């Protein structure tokens, strides 16, 4: 009869396993086992050593990661990893020759690389160092410098600047090898007119004078970085001191004013697909470009233009979805909202057709989460269609030649244990591995695409299961309440022997940002687990308006006015929970991180009287402080000629007064390059001028995630005690 | 039966009056009455209007202050005051012609002056603007630019750089008019090699991007600014486009390495006195310089050198005391430690004499606080001699011609009400005003120097007295405990009907920095008053080793090792207090600001088990972070060749562990240019790595004094609740 301690959480007492494989072909994959990379034969467990407990130990214990060339001939050894922003980071590398069985030592690779990657084919390498792109046709050979315009915080070649890395692409990389590795496409960013944000860094107590970090960061309405797209021919390198990359210029309907590069996708090797977006993400264009053999130039004829548009809000969930072309690149499938506002799959022809560019292959009041693979006859995707649960994830498949032949491949398997699947098909969809993140303990299995014969079970958390037997785990209800005649899903983490007649304190876990989803069928062991299993607190989340994957009617509901409906609906959800009975209305709280911290703060400052206390970590206090790409996507420009008013209305400080009726805890990281601290600093100041007492806590040199070990532990313990004090427990 | 509320303190319910006069001659003074400057006749209350309720109102309500030329012909009107550091600030000025009865409008004075002042004689003005010195022989006339080397954060002409303003001179000014206004002496500082500290400023929530303030600030051991001393001849100005100032060069025994300018003092008009100090304040030299009429140059012959030295610690209390020359400038009196280490008054002859430069005029185990005036026959000073109370202040006087004719002039007056006097003699000591800060309510009276006949009572707080009748005011014991065979004074603010048999919670109010004094006989209405009158908390302070005015044996006890004895003795004092009975050992706290916050933190982190909780505001966490002039004066240089070890031993972070046994509250101001925040940031981080929970609070854009109105209120309320929570009250 043991509970789930805060220590169980902080020390990670109960490890949850998984099976992260790396398809190397249509029939074999790689898998790390006891610091050994093994090659597995999907079909017969037939295994085999690929890299030993050994190898990795040479470069000390600093071996951050590894990357096997596609032709399985060499292996990249990452080490001396140094983080920088969400995805950026710099490591040192070593190429290990599998065949010759030793480390290539000749033409090494810069001891401070910002990015590196093999071609899709052989053993070609492209890496960015000092903001410049370099190429090595083969591992033993010398580097060919592709660019030289590179310069810190000014010119980025092959890597994204801060805002692009964070809001557009999602990674540091801005390189794209064409299939058959003939070309190498890359983007270039000029951060010149972009303003700077400059926070302090204290470092070891031995540093006598604190450093200062500057970053070209564009806040709402500020001048943004600029782009340029190039494609350099890899094959000529050996016969020149320099090659002259060819530039593609965004489509006219985008060049008139500020705009961004949305996504890159190689169709074939003489055809590439680029997606562009206007600064006001109202409009989007996806041009298809062909390589002219004669004049050695790329053409992006307006006939292959393709326009995406939204009269309700913005394009895509967080940006236009990616296209998936056929072999002959004659057509492509892409997820777009249908006549009803439901993100579905439809076909396109390379050449645009007058208001008929699409033919939907999917219909219904549910949405396609993502396209997973496109065979010559099949299109495997993932949707939240099954059991009308927008919070669930299942793997479907449609026969191209017959859109009727639609079959779910995960819906049966374990309806009880699994309702949230993650997938991963082999190079040519011959086999497919399934990741059950579903309600119960995560379950990984691999099947044979043909008949779905579950070849075997790769990982069932039997171990974690035996362990959790001696612990009083909490439960998780995932249902939905209905407001103004609409389904609105929510979830609750119920403490152990939860008795519907007694009354418990309630903690609302918030996010509620555009296209967010907190109510789902995924298994987790987090802080909320400890809060229910040991403090008997009910932790609930509610996906209200402007959220999830339930159509644009719900998502675009927030458009041009954040800090409105999503906040309100969060309060309503609490009301409703109270009406369910088992909630001690005298002890109801709410917390959130980043966007969630904003809503938390906006709820606490609404004076609805419904909440006692709350905690906001790295909150946003007013949209002018946040970056352009994100903010503007929903708020437009902060100008009288546009949406300045809603900007100035959705301020947290403008609600300082109402905080007198609440115990508030504001937490922020000192080195937060994302949500600047200026944000919380502006809040504390607002409350101080209002004469409202509250509790604060800064985390010296912590990121936007306050995730260093010691900090992570400290911030959760401190938040626990805050709730304990607030709920009269502790 | 009403108590003294936290509101009584914060809103300043009970105003304490005073009488701030401005001697205009040996017989008349100025006094502000209902926004009217009145001229009073010391002798017969004979008054008279000098400036009206009027005048001041023209320049709106922005009239920051006023300054009457010595020849009472014009008045300076300060307005548009903008603070910057402790004493620095910039205002706008207007010269008001008393005679012509209107504002001089012609040759105005720069709308952003950094400093200004009349000559000691007529109506000459010298002011610094844009770091350059300017002169106006008379108010209606045009400015004569004296310097032009001026440049922000680099070259300072006539004003002090940050460290000098803060640690050496105590004011922004670096100008000195000679008597008879012929010359104008000034110092010039080059901040060139001095490193920068750069904190952020957020300002109104409308500022989209936070500013950054940089300041050339030299931390312990860092490169210091450099000095140069000039004297320009004011009389030539009218006959040149430019004048060439003459430079005086510090004495040889100081020029070998880093050093500072200690103090400037004009002896006569052909003789000036400069005091210099080595970077290691072990040594000091006070040269006397004469103006050569022939070669038009100043000479500072080594024969008039004069050397001050300390084999126990540093020179002076916070720097060498100032000299007080005779009329004919043949001799001068200055406060220096005697053979026993007691700061006393002794005579010097312009020319130094081989190890006999001094002749003490004072002896005893008490010290002379300061010299107040030097007549042709009398020397008025202030000491803590009376009743062997080092915490008391009395005005004495000695007949020069007979050192026996020593008489105290304030010791009788009101032994009950007054034990802490402040003085102020007329231009030639014909009359003298007394300021009773003593035990009881402050009492101001003026007397006639001849026989001390108290002419009248200028201010007795009868008003405040009538008011405090209906309030249960706390008492204040000022006694001393004896440790290791030595007197050590302490004081306690006892709650109203204090009953020696019951038991109260204890709050130690700390400072305990070198030459500090918290135990004195001065009347005050502060936070501690509220804490006793309404929370029944005993607030006590203790002057232990390395403190007050009780000889160098006690003061220099800390030398080369801060964060030692002064911390310990503070704990001992608590022990002793407990042994006195009336202290609930289960509820003992301790707080402090700046230096006090350091000791508080060092005590809490000592694991002595004696304290429950504590509060540290803008603390120092390790001496390498604090500035050079201050730190080095007691710690030397942070180098292995000197005192690096004691620097690294006295760290607050090195005691993180021991904080597990304490409720700690760390508070810091965001725009603290004095104690950088880097300090608290380094502490929070230390505790977080130690896994020690604690409470924090930052004050957005607040100074080192967190003294803006809203902030001041907020920080005390928050501290109150912290103690309330800690002491189980609230
Ligand atoms: C906190 N999560 C901040 C607050 C605003 C925005 C959101 C949501 N945000 C981000 O960090 C975003 N970059 C966000 C990360 C995942 C999708 C976009």
Kindly write down the DSSP assignment for every residue of B430-490, as one continuous string: SEEEEEE-SSSS-EEEEEETTT--EEEEEEE-HHHHHHHTTB---EEEEEEEEETTEEEEE
CA of A594 to the centre of ligand 1 (A): 7
Q: Do B570 and B695 share a domain, yes or no?
A: yes
This PDB structure is determined at a resolution in Å of 3.1
Q: Among residues B676, B508, B654, which one has the least CA distance to residue B594?
A: B676
CA separation (Å) from B560 to B107, B164, B624, B649? 54, 22, 14, 12
Mutate to test the pocket of ligand 1, among A618, A652, A675 (most ligand atoms within 8 A of CB): A675
Find the closest chain A residue to B716 by CA distance.
A693
* Residues A8 and A40 both lie in one domain: no
Dihedrals phi, psi of B5, to nearest 5 degrees = -60, 160
CB B27 within 8 A of CB B431: yes
Number of CB atoms found within 10 A of residue A511's CB: 21
Tell me which residue of A272, A290, A100 sits closest to A177, measured CA to CA. A272
Method: X-ray
Strand segments (E) across B61-208: 63-68, 74-83, 89-97, 102-103, 115-118, 125-129, 132-136, 144-145, 155-157, 175-177, 183-190, 196-201
Q: Which of B659, B686, B647, B621 is nearest to B562 (CA)?
A: B647
Domain count, chain B: 2
B273 in helix, strand or coil?
strand
Q: How many CB atoms lie within 10 A of CB B472?
A: 15
Q: Which of A319, A543, A674, A703 to mutate to test the pocket of ligand 1 (most atoms within 8 A of CB)?
A: A674
DSSP letter (8 states) at residue B385 = -
Phi, psi of A466 (to 5 degrees): -55, -40
On whether both A602 and A553 belong to a single domain, the answer is yes
Claim to verify: residue A367 and residue A485 sit in the same structural domain? no
Whether A448 and A480 share a structural domain:
no
Catalytic residues of B: 594, 672, 704
Residue B182: C-alpha distances to residues A129, A521, B146, B236, B385 (Å): 67, 89, 14, 9, 41
Helices marked H in B514-667: 527-533, 552-555, 565-579, 595-604, 628-635, 644-649
- Cα A557 to middle of ligand 1, angstroms: 19
Query: Rounded to 5 degrees, what are φ and ψ at B709?
Result: -55, -70
User: Under a CB-based contact definition with an 8 Å cutoff, are residues B369 and B344 in contact?
Assistant: no
Q: CB contact, 8 Å: B671 with chain A?
A: no
Q: A554 is in which domain, residue-wise? A: 1-12+470-730
SS3 content of chain A, % helix, strand, coil (to 5): 20, 35, 45
The DSSP H or E segment spanning B504 is strand B504-510
Which residue's C-alpha comes closest to atom 3 of ligand 1?
A594
Give the residue, out of A218, A219, A594, with the most ligand 1 atoms within 8 A of its beta carbon, to mutate for a pocket test.
A594
Helix and strand numbers, DSSP H then E, in chain B: 12, 44
Whether residue B368 is found in the same domain as residue B492: no
The number of CA neighbours under 13 Å toward the Cβ of A547 is 28
Determine contact, residues B262/B314, Cβ cutoff 8 Å: no
Asked if A114 is an interface residue toward chain B (Cβ–Cβ < 8 A), one would say no
Please tell me the number of Cα atoms within 13 Å of B282 on its side-chain side.
10
Task: Out of A439, A461, A483, pick the residue that ends a domain.
Answer: A461
Residues A409 and A476 in one domain: no
Strand-pairing partners, residue A414, are none
**Residues B397 and B537 placed together within one structural domain of the fold:** no
Q: In this structure, what token pair is assigned to residue B265? A: 């003092």
Residue B128 shares a structural domain with residue B268: yes
Distance CA A604, CA A598 (A): 10
Intra-chain end-to-end CA distance of chain A, in Å: 20
Query: Encoding tokens for residue A97?
Result: 């020759």
CA distances B315 to B283, B391, B631, Å, are 7, 22, 14
Q: Are residues B426 and B519 in the same domain?
A: no
Close Cβ partners of B222 (under 8 Å, ≥ 6 residues apart)? A208, B194, B195, B628
> Closest to B622 (Cβ–Cβ): which among A205, A212, A717?
A205
Closest in B195, B219, B700 to A681, CB measured: B700
- Distance (Å, rounded) from C-alpha B80 to C-alpha B408? 44
Look up the CATH number of the domain holding residue B483. Answer: 3.40.50.1820
Q: Residue A666 and residue A598: Cα distance in Å, rounded?
A: 11
CA–CA distance, B680 with B667 (Å, rounded to integer):
8
A61 SS3 class: coil
DSSP string, A106-120: SS---TTBSEEEE-S
Q: Are B113 and B98 in contact (CB under 8 A)?
A: no
The answer to whether B194 and B627 are in contact (CB under 8 A) is no
**Mutate which of B196, B681, B702 to test chain A, going by most A C-beta atoms within 10 A?**
B681
Q: Which residues contact B676 (CB under 8 A, 6 or more apart)?
A: A210, B197, B199, B625
Nearest beta carbon to residue A688 from set B198, B208, B710: B710
Using a CB-CB distance cutoff of 8 angstroms, which residues of chain B are in contact with residue A651?
A: 205
Contact of B442 with B523, CB cutoff 8 Å: yes
Indicate which CATH number applies to the domain containing B310: 2.140.10.30
**What burial letters (b/e) apply to B651-682, b meaning 16+ CB within 10 Å?**
bbbbbbebbeebbbbbbbbbbbbbbbbbbbbb
> What separation in Å is there between the alpha carbon of A166 and the centre of ligand 1?
9
> Do B528 and B416 fall within a single domain?
no
Assign A645 to helix, strand or coil.
Answer: helix
Closest CA to B514 of B627, B339, B647, B631: B631
Residue B384, both tokens? 């803590």
Position of tokens 């022989």? B137
The candidate with the shortest Cα–Cα distance to A130, out of A142, A112, A146, A143, is: A112
Nearest to A628 by CA among A98, A161, A236: A161
Determine how many CB atoms are found less than 10 A away from the CB of residue A302: 12
**Which chain A residues are closer than 8 Å to B714 by Cβ?**
688, 691, 693
**Does B580 reach chain A within 8 Å, measured CB to CB?**
no
Strand partners, A359: A347
- List pocket residues of ligand 1, CB cut-off 6 Å: A 166-167, 318, 513, 594-595, 620, 626, 630, 674-675
Mutation site for B-interface testing, chosen from A637, A683, A685, A703 by largest number of B Cβ within 10 Å: A685
What is the distance between the alpha carbons of residues A360 and A347, in angstroms, rounded to a whole number? 6
* Exposure string for B337-368, b = 16+ CB within 10 A, e = fewer: bbeebbbbbbbbebebeeeebbeebbeeebbb
Which of A208, A624, A670 shows the shortest C-beta gap to B208? A624
* B688/A710 Cβ within 8 A: yes
Closest to A416 (Cα-Cα) out of A387, A445, A382 = A387
Interchain proximity B698–A701, CB inside 8 Å: no
What tokens appear for B200 in the block? 């952020």
DSSP letter at B340 equals T
For chain B, give percent helix, strand, coil, nearest 5.
Answer: 20, 35, 45
Residue with tokens 């249960």: B472
Closest by Cβ to A713, choosing from B197, B682, B691: B691
By CB neighbour count within 10 A (0-12 exposed, 13-18 middle, 19+ buried), where does A605 fall? Answer: buried
CA distances (Å), origin B556, targets A228, B316, B641: 68, 11, 21
Given CB atoms, is B213 within the 8 Å cutoff of chain A?
A: no
End position of a domain, from candidates A403, A428, A461: A461
Number of Cβ within a 10 Å radius of residue B198: 15
Ligand 1 centre and the CA of A8: distance in Å? Answer: 28
One domain for residues A390 and A530: no
Nearest CA, atom 18, ligand 1: A167
CB atoms within 10 A of CB B233: 17
Residues 217 through 256 of chain A touching chain B, CB cutoff 8 Å: 219-220, 222
> B728 CA to middle of ligand 1, Å?
42
In the block, tokens 């402080």 appear at A625
Query: Are the C-beta atoms of residues A369 and A359 closer than 8 Å to each other?
Result: no
Question: How do A613-617 and A663-669 pair as beta strands?
Answer: parallel
Last residue of a domain, one of A433, A461, A489: A461
């Amino acid at each position: 009869r043991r509970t789930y301690t805060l220590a169980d959480y902080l020390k990670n007492t109960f490890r949850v396993k998984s099976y992260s494989l790396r398809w190397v072909s249509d029939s074999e994959y790689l898998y790390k086992q006891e610091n050994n990379i093994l090659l597995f034969n999907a079909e017969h467990g037939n295994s085999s050593i690929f890299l030993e407990n050994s190898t990795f130990e040479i470069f000390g214990d600093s071996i951050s990661d590894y990357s096997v060339s596609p032709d399985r001939l060499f292996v990249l050894l990452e080490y001396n990893y140094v983080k920088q922003w969400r995805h950026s980071y710099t490591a040192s590398y070593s190429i290990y020759d599998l065949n010759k069985r030793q480390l290539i030592t000749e033409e090494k690779i810069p001891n401070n690389t910002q990015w590196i990657t093999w071609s899709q084919e052989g053993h070609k390498l492209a890496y960015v160092w000092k903001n410049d792109i370099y190429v090595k046709i083969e591992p033993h050979l010398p580097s060919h410098r592709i660019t030289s315009t590179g310069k810190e915080n000014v010119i980025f070649n092959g890597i994204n600047d801060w805002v692009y890395e964070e809001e557009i692409f999602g990674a540091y990389s801005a390189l794209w090898w064409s299939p058959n590795g003939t070309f190498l496409a890359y983007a270039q960013f000029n951060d010149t007119g972009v303003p700077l944000i400059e926070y302090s860094f204290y470092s070891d107590e031995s540093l006598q004078y604190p450093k200062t970090v500057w970053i070209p960061y564009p806040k709402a309405g500020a001048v943004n970085p600029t782009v340029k797209f190039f494609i350099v021919n890899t094959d000529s390198l050996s016969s020149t001191t320099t090659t002259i990359p060819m530039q593609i210029t965004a489509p006219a309907s985008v060049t008139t004013g500020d705009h961004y590069l949305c996504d890159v996708a190689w169709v074939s090797e003489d055809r590439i697909s680029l997606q562009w977006l206007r600064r006001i993400q109202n409009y989007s264009v996806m041009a298809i470009c062909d390589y002219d053999k004669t004049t050695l130039v790329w053409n992006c004829p307006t006939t292959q233009e393709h326009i995406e548009t939204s009269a309700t809000g913005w394009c895509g969930r967080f940006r236009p979805a990616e296209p998936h072309f056929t072999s002959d690149g004659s057509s492509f499938y892409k997820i777009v909202s249908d006549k009803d506002g439901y993100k579905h799959i439809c076909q396109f022809q390379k050449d645009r057709k007058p208001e008929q560019v699409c033919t939907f292959i999917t219909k219904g009041a549910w949405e396609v989460i993502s396209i997973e693979a496109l065979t010559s006859d099949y299109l495997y995707y993932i949707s939240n269609e099954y059991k009308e649960m927008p919070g669930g994830r299942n793997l479907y498949k449609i026969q191209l030649t017959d859109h009727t032949n639609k079959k779910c491949l995960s819906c049966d398997l374990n309806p009880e244990r699994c309702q949230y699947y993650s997938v991963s098909l082999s190079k040519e969809a011959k086999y497919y591995q399934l990741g059950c993140r579903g309600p119960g303990l995560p379950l990984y299995t691999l099947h044979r695409s043909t008949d779905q014969k579950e070849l075997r079970v790769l990982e069932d958390n039997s171990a974690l299961d035996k362990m959790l037997q001696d612990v009083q785990m909490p439960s998780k209800k995932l249902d939905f309440i209905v407001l103004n005649e609409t389904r609105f899903w929510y979830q609750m983490i119920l403490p152990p022997h939860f008795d519907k007649s007694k009354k418990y304190p309630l903690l609302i876990d918030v996010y509620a940002g555009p296209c967010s989803q907190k109510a789902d069928a995924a298994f987790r062991l987090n802080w909320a687990t400890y809060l229910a299993s040991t403090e008997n607190i009910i932790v609930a989340s509610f996906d209200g308006r402007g959220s999830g994957y339930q159509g644009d009617k719900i998502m675009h509901a927030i458009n041009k006015r954040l800090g409105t409906l999503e906040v309100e609906d969060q309060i309503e959800a609490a009301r409703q929970f109270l009406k369910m009975g088992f909630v001690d209305s005298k002890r109801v709280a709410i917390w959130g991180w980043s966007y969630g911290g904003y809503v938390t703060s906006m709820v606490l400052g609404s004076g609805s009287g419904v909440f006692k206390c709350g905690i906001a970590v790295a909150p946003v206090s007013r949209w002018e402080y946040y970056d352009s790409v994100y903010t503007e996507r929903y708020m437009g420009l902060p100008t009288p000629e546009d949406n300045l008013d809603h900007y100035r209305n959705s301020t947290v400080m403008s609600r300082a007064e109402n905080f007198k009726q609440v115990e508030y805890l504001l937490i922020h990281g000192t080195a937060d390059d994302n949500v600047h601290f200026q944000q919380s600093a502006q809040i504390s100041k607002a409350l101080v001028d209002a004469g409202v007492d509250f509790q604060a806590m800064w985390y010296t040199d912590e990121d936007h995630g306050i995730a260093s070990s010691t900090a992570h532990q400290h911030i959760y313990s401190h938040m626990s005690h805050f709730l304990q004090q607030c709920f009269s427990l502790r």
